[PDB]
Design a protein around this nucleic acid. Structure first.
Ligand SMILES: [Mg+2]
Ligand SMILES: [Mg+2]
Ligand SMILES: [Mg+2]
Ligand SMILES: [Mg+2]
Ligand SMILES: [Mg+2]
Ligand SMILES: [Mg+2]
Ligand SMILES: [Mg+2]
Ligand SMILES: [Mg+2]
Ligand SMILES: [Mg+2]
Ligand SMILES: [Mg+2]
Ligand SMILES: [Mg+2]
Ligand SMILES: [Mg+2]
Ligand SMILES: [Mg+2]
Ligand SMILES: [Mg+2]
Ligand SMILES: [Mg+2]
Ligand SMILES: [Mg+2]
Ligand SMILES: [Mg+2]
Ligand SMILES: [Mg+2]
Ligand SMILES: [Mg+2]
Ligand SMILES: [Mg+2]
Ligand SMILES: [Mg+2]
Ligand SMILES: [Mg+2]
Ligand SMILES: [Mg+2]
Ligand SMILES: [Mg+2]
Ligand SMILES: [Mg+2]
Ligand SMILES: [Mg+2]
Ligand SMILES: [Mg+2]
Ligand SMILES: [Mg+2]
Ligand SMILES: [Mg+2]
Ligand SMILES: [Mg+2]
Ligand SMILES: [Mg+2]
Ligand SMILES: [Mg+2]
Ligand SMILES: [Mg+2]
Ligand SMILES: [Mg+2]
Ligand SMILES: [Mg+2]
Ligand SMILES: [Mg+2]
Ligand SMILES: [Mg+2]
Ligand SMILES: [Mg+2]
Ligand SMILES: [Mg+2]
Ligand SMILES: [Mg+2]
Ligand SMILES: [Mg+2]
Lengths: 53, 53, 124, 210, 124, 147
RNA sequence: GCCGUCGCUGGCAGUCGGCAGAGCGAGAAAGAGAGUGGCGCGGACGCUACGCCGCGACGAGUAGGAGGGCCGCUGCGGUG
RNA sequence: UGGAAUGCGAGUGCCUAGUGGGCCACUUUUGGUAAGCAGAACUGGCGCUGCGGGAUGAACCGAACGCCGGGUUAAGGCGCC
RNA sequence: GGGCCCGGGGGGCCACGCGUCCCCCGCGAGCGCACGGGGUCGGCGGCGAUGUCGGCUACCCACCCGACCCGUCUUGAAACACGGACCAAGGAGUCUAACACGUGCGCGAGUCGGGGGCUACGAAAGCCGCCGUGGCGCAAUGAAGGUGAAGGCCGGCGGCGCGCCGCCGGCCGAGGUGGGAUCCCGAGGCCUUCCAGUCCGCCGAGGGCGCACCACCGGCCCGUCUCGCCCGCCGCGCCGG
RNA sequence: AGGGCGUGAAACCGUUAAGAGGUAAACGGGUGGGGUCCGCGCAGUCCGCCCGGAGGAUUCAACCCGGCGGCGCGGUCCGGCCGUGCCGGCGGGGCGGAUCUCCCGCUCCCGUCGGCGGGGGACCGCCCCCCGGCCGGCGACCGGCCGCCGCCGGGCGCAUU
RNA sequence: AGACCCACUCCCCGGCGCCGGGGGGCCCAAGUCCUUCUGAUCGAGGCCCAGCCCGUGGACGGUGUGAGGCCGGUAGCGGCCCCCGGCGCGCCGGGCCCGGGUCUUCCCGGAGUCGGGUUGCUUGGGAAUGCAGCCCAAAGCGGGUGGUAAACUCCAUCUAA
């Protein structure tokens, strides 16, 4: 959970352009499906409009 | 992990609760394998009781 | 890791079928279509896949190369075997045992190859 | 009815509270409406600062806050007088005036006087008729560089005078802070009665003397 | 608290193990060199432990280091260190019951008159 | 969510979980805190001693700003300054003591819980406790009163 | 015999294969230890570990509590 | 020589519904001529509970209940029903 | 009768190498049968294309045994207690606020931007940090004025008379007893031709550090009561400690 | 779908068909009889190995060429990225600090001297980037060569395979 | 107001003329291509490398299903045409003859109101928060407030009717 390899940048023609970028550390962050589903659950209610009889 | 966020006033990546998730590798390592008792993989099914008399 | 990725997809996957008290997985490189850690064809570094050839002659054996785990385009090596029934299995048996490439999938691959070959015989 | 242990609660729902529930579903609309009015006001008054007129520094009342300064309402007439700005002219060049406010101490008076003089230095002043520059108008060279300032004008901040470490003298060491505090309370508590006792005793002794 | 329990005689060069979070204590001045294993360590407690030369393990690293738990010092946080345990026991209105009542506000006007002084009815 | 609640499990069960004998009636016992000195007395005396009666003086127009006096113990005193302040003064030879101004940190009174590191310090504050003053003096410090 | 529950907070990561060697149920602690001197290319299933397997006991129920529903209805985000 | 027998894993803490009309039997027992009456003690029951017997029956006798096969019983029975 | 049924002078023994000293007088090979860790046959027969074979349950009918109509209040309902002629659709623990405890997640002596501001889905989301004002927590206690959370030892001095109080300077230092998961040490020991002694492990009497938690005993903070001797000073006080 | 016409339920009714009928009907358990249909039944399974008879080949192994792949403690091959490692850097920098400190604006006082605010600099902590040495990974992170092995394509093998 | 120094010509009203957001109207991409299902289709299949064509337009609606390309639309700092408004620039007839500082001398305030008693209502406002009726009824270094009634005394802060 510490390795950060080099990622290739592809040109608009689908070929590697020769440039490389070290993998950002965020892509090694803990993957928590329970947290994501909790946040997605509660944030998705914030764009609701009220209804009432 | 080493450098805090620069564009967020005060933030850093969430820490890992488990650094190595390769459970198969962890269990097959000599360190753990040396501490194990021998497995008991023999099934002792029910014996039918026959009357000795 | 494989174990981490299984914990994310064991019950949430576009390939998961839960129906009639049965569970199946429709992803490639799953030798039994089984929603299982052993037979999942996505989460392991090495995987074995047996498929029928694009034409109904022979089988295609897929093995995951070691290096490009994050590069789907170059990840899988496909080999077409269109020999007789016994010869096809012998190649598959050797590609697994001799290379020690998932030796625990040996019979699953061999049983799948027989089922694909048997399917390609004329239907009576 | 109460059930086992718990808190005794007195909710204030014995009126027709449902008749007067203020929902906040118009909150995002209000925020857009206010923002749209800030931008339209900034365009109208440009290049004058959008935040508005410069405000003076003031010390918050009461002992809970008198350690903090903040923005006041307007500069006192004394501060404008000391800085040589006419009170009626002041507003016309973006200076807030407060005829009510007093200046009890010199330090706060001079802090705001310096504030005004500094503001008067950064003030770019355009001619009333662009083709006819006048005595006080800023030069043409510095008018082409005029831009609208965003945020409060010369923001007010609480700055603490960092005091560097020093050797402790024997005088400070022997100081008795708690004992000094306790005696100060007693003297302030007994001041009036003590003088009342001194006055009566003097009269008592005098009547015996004479 | 970890330093206090890891400073007792005979516990040198042992791994402190807590199934929980290691918080920081600003009231401490000097942090010695510890070797700890925890589920979580607060951001400021990590810098202090590491700055002193200590090591912070994760429970998967403890298994590789100490498969059987040898050379460890298992530690627990205070369990009765919670506001709720102030409110448990004999009801506050019983003799010698130092239980904490449930009051919306705290002050002279909030459950102090009758039953809490002899001057108003009684006390116990 | 209502799909996780008892009401979904009380479907087809007569009485909806309130009993066949006592039933669920409107307000048996009174509304709110009724009955305190009456049929609800045991609850109030058992769990809310002191609830009834009056104690102490009244104060009209209380202004809580006037009594504002946040306090800090001596065990947390050195957190009001940077870490490099304490180590630099710990390792300096002149004997110069750093100034800790509690009012700048938002405290008015210094209290004596805890122990101080063996290190001279100059403490400013509106108020001090007796044991706080002795402990600050025990390490060679000085107490300074501000207004 | 079969179903379920409870218990053993039971067993299985050892599928350690031709870089091989098949055991750890057995009355009675602790090593199928390490060393130093005196032709064939083969070997079922398994393991959704939230899984699979074994053994033993047990099973009435109003009011009431709890668990599990690959029970059912309508709409939303994803997916098929 | 864990200092009688026997049996059994225990301790502990939170939150908590319903209930707060009961009634019946052996023994003991108050009032009353007595009551399928009113009131108590003990245990056990019915209430909440089916099942075999008492023809029938809230409580009696036997016995308590997952869905089944074989065997044997309890209390009761074996002219015919 | 009991003494491996003491010792001497026809019938069963889970006796059967031997060198010895002497009480007393560590591996043979095979093969086969089975009252042996729960059933098999390496045993057979008949019938079958237009009237016959199989089909639990389901449709109708018959018979034997069983069998009173539900919901409800009730000690007790099949009741001569009440509602119910029948069918469809509708029909009853919800939502807001407060509180309590439990559980899950985030961060952690902190935490929270909820109000405000900045920058189709989107009224979303993102950001603020000299926007953390503010809430809750980090301190209690008293009606209040207010106060507001360990000590011991060494050396020296003043007073009273080896002991006590006060003042100085140096050392150590957040309590103890009982129980206590876990951990640590290890008397001895875990075999294979026989001895010596190693490297790794492994069990273990006894002995230690003792988590959390509980019981008990001390300590400290605030109110109040009793007793009493001192210490401070810009205010010598109906002062303060 | 024939003008209150999409679909067209139940209760209730007409007719047709089958069955039955003196303890109101209905109901649980166990069979039996009869129908409605279903098996789209009616000489009854499939699979592996081996023996034998008949045939027929995009014919077997072994060798040669080429591609791809796995593994290598290659006992210690080269090159790479790279260490949420450790060391030496006159290293070229960003962030933070309640650690210290030559320039200016305003201001009190005689043309001076002192105070507020505004900036360098030094120092410390952390991070990024450059350079050198050890140990290290490449199993969330690989190339070239060499070796072994496997697979595939093409040759050659032409028949007791 | 006066004296003394100092500084001042653009500020507005009514008319007249010229130059750079709002309402309305009209328009602006691309398949009805080849097979085929259907009562009819907007369905299915196809449209060389490449990938039918447009796409800043794949919102929606209509049309004999189910349509980015059939029609309306949708997109666009797209276009054209009217009307209104806003903002500048000149000409004419008018008004104003406008200020700052320092001294000298002058002037300065709201009454049947305040305030007080009592009554009634009202407030969290408690020896009376606010309001109202009746009675009494002001002062001018005064008056009001200073959350416990009152006398004396300092202070603070405003200036009611
Ligand atoms: Mg209740
Ligand atoms: Mg129930
Ligand atoms: Mg009811
Ligand atoms: Mg309930
Ligand atoms: Mg009730
Ligand atoms: Mg009742
Ligand atoms: Mg209720
Ligand atoms: Mg049950
Ligand atoms: Mg009775
Ligand atoms: Mg009842
Ligand atoms: Mg019972
Ligand atoms: Mg019973
Ligand atoms: Mg009878
Ligand atoms: Mg039976
Ligand atoms: Mg009958
Ligand atoms: Mg009948
Ligand atoms: Mg009823
Ligand atoms: Mg009755
Ligand atoms: Mg009934
Ligand atoms: Mg009756
Ligand atoms: Mg009734
Ligand atoms: Mg009726
Ligand atoms: Mg309905
Ligand atoms: Mg909680
Ligand atoms: Mg919207
Ligand atoms: Mg129709
Ligand atoms: Mg209709
Ligand atoms: Mg119709
Ligand atoms: Mg008929
Ligand atoms: Mg068009
Ligand atoms: Mg359409
Ligand atoms: Mg088409
Ligand atoms: Mg369309
Ligand atoms: Mg199309
Ligand atoms: Mg168009
Ligand atoms: Mg348009
Ligand atoms: Mg006025
Ligand atoms: Mg008035
Ligand atoms: Mg009224
Ligand atoms: Mg009222
Ligand atoms: Mg007063």
């Amino acid at each position: 959970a510490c390795a950060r390899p080099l990622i290739s940048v592809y040109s608009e023609k689908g070929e590697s352009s020769g440039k490389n970028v070290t993998l950002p550390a965020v892509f090694k962050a803990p993957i928590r499906p329970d947290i994501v589903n909790f946040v997605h659950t509660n944030l998705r209610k914030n764009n609701r409009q009220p209804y009432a009889v | 992990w080493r450098k805090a966020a620069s564009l967020k006033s005060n933030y850093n990546l969430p820490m890992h609760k488990m650094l190595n998730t390769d459970l198969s590798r962890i269990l097959k390592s000599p360190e753990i394998q040396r501490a194990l008792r021998a497995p008991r993989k023999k099934i002792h099914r029910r014996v039918l009781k026959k009357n000795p008399l | 890791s494989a174990h981490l990725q299984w914990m994310v997809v064991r019950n949430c996957s576009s390939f998961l079928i839960k129906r009639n008290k049965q569970t199946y997985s429709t992803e490639p490189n799953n030798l039994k279509a089984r929603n299982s850690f052993r037979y999942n064809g996505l989460i392991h570094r090495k995987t074995v896949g047996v498929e029928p050839a694009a034409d109904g002659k022979g089988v295609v054996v897929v093995m995951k190369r070691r290096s490009g785990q994050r590069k789907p385009a170059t990840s899988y090596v496909r080999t077409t075997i269109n020999k007789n029934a016994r010869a096809t299995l012998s190649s598959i048996r050797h590609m697994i045992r001799k290379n020690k490439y998932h030796p625990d999938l040996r019979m699953a691959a061999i049983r799948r190859a027989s089922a694909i070959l048997r399917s390609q015989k004329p239907v009576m | 009815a109460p059930s086992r242990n718990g808190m005794i609660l007195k909710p204030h729902f014995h009126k027709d509270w449902q008749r007067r529930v203020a929902t906040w579903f118009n909150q995002p609309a209000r925020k857009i409406r206010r923002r749209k009015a800030r931008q339209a006001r900034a365009r109208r008054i440009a290049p004058r600062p959008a935040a508005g007129p410069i405000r003076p520094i003031v010390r918050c009342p009461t002992v809970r806050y008198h350690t903090k300064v903040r923005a006041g309402r307007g500069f006192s007439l004394e501060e404008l007088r000391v800085a040589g700005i006419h009170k009626k002219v002041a507003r016309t060049i973006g200076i807030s005036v407060d005829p009510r406010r007093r200046n009890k101490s010199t330090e706060s008076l001079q802090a705001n006087v310096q504030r005004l003089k500094e503001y008067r230095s950064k003030l770019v002043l355009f001619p009333r008729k662009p083709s006819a520059p006048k005595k006080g108008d800023s030069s043409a060279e510095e008018l082409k560089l005029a831009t609208q300032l965003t945020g409060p004008v010369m923001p007010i901040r609480n700055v603490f005078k960092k005091e560097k470490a020093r050797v402790i003298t024997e005088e400070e060491k022997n100081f008795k802070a708690f004992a000094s505090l306790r005696m100060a309370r007693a003297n302030a508590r007994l001041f009036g009665i003590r003088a009342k006792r001194a006055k009566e005793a003097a009269e008592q002794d005098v009547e015996k003397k004479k | 608290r970890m330093i206090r329990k890891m400073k007792l005689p005979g516990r040198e060069n042992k791994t402190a193990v807590v199934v929980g979070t290691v918080t920081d204590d600003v009231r401490v001045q000097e942090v010695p060199k510890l070797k700890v294993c925890a589920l979580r360590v607060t951001s400021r407690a990590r810098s202090r432990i590491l700055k002193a030369g200590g090591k912070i393990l994760t429970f998967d690293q403890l298994a590789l280091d100490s498969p059987k738990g040898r050379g460890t010092v298992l530690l627990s946080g205070p369990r009765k260190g919670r506001e709720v345990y102030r409110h448990f026991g004999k009801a506050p209105g019983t003799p010698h019951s130092h239980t904490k009542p449930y009051v919306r506000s705290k002050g002279r006007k909030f459950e102090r008159a009758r039953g809490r002084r002899a001057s108003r009815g009684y006390k116990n | 969510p209502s799909r996780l609640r008892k009401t979904r499990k009380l479907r087809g069960h007569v009485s909806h979980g309130h009993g066949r004998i006592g039933k669920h009636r409107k307000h048996p016992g009174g509304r709110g805190n009724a009955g305190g000195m009456h049929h609800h007395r045991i609850n109030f005396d058992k769990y809310h001693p002191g609830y009834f009666g009056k104690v102490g003086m009244r104060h009209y127009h209380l202004k809580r700003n006037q009594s504002f006096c946040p306090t800090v113990n001596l065990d947390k005193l050195w957190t009001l300054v940077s870490e490099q302040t304490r180590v630099n003064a710990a390792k300096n030879k002149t004997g110069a003591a750093p100034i800790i101004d509690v009012v700048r940190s938002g405290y008015y009174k210094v209290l004596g819980k805890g122990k101080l590191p063996k290190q001279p310090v100059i403490v400013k504050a509106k108020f001090f406790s007796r044991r706080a003053e002795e402990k600050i003096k025990g390490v060679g410090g000085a107490c300074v009163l501000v207004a």
